[PDB]
Design a binder for this molecule. Structure first.
Ligand SMILES: O=P(O)(O)O[C@@H]1O[C@H](CO)[C@@H](O)[C@H](O)[C@H]1O
Ligand code: ALF
Ligand SMILES: [Mg+2]
Ligand SMILES: [Mg+2]
Length: 218
């Protein structure tokens, strides 16, 4: 059987993308940059804070000092952290808590493979920390999806080969990252968006231990 499940955060466990959009758009507008729209933000799925900011600067060919860059990223992050202060166990997506319980009871390792450095805070707010055997640290493993690095790191963090792992993802870049790690992807979303070549479920209530085992056996 598969020996680990490697979880993306946003769009899988819960979704805080709206708050990232609001905060990046506010930052861009404060510094006179146009183009941070919903289409642009959908392209930031699985993308590090620093790569995200650079994409925004690139809209206007804006050059900033390293210190200015750090301050811009901090300003946006502070705003986003204020926006997520009310996240609680209520925000957990359907099926996810039961899946975590079932994986743990079956002695299957659980790791977070998110690009967001806010992962630990979010898991704590949602009362999920105790289910996670490890959290891959994007400050140590900074490559944005679709690079496989974060998933490889998550598997190493629980002592399981990626080839013996399942990855759960809601984004194109994240699915590719899982593929290139060697793990088996199961997407959540639409096949039009995420592919007709892998198993996709329409929402997270379909992520059950039984379903993961069915997919693994096929
Ligand atoms: O600022 P962190 O929370 O570290 O990173 C975030 O990660 C998000 C992906 O989960 C991405 O969409 C954001 O643009 C990025 O700021
Ligand atoms: F939390 Al993600 F790709 F949605 F790392
Ligand atoms: Mg995601
Ligand atoms: Mg989706």
């Amino acid at each position: 059987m598969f020996k680990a499940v490697l979880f993306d955060l946003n769009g899988v466990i819960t979704d805080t993308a709206e708050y990232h959009f609001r905060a990046w758009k506010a930052l861009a507008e404060e510094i006179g940059i146009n183009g941070v729209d919903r289409q642009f933000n959908e392209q930031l799925k699985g993308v590090s804070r620093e790569d995200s900011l650079q994409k925004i600067l690139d809209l206007a060919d804006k050059k900033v000092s390293a210190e200015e860059f750090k301050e811009l990223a901090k300003r946006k992050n502070d705003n986003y952290v204020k926006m997520i202060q009310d996240v609680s166990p209520a925000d957990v997506y359907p099926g996810i808590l039961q899946l975590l319980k079932d994986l743990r009871s079956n002695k299957i390792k659980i790791a977070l493979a998110s690009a967001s450095k806010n992962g630990p805070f979010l898991l704590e707010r949602m009362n999920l920390t105790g289910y996670f055997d490890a959290i891959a640290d994007p400050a140590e493993v900074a490559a944005s999806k679709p690079a496989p690095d974060i998933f490889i790191a998550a598997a190493h963090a629980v002592g399981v080969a990626p080839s013996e792992s399942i990855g759960l993802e809601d984004s194109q870049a994240g699915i590719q990252a899982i593929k290139d790690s060697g793990a088996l992807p199961i997407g959540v979303g639409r096949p039009e968006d995420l592919g007709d070549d892998i198993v996709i479920v329409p929402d997270t209530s379909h992520y059950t231990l039984e379903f993961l085992k069915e997919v693994w056996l096929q």
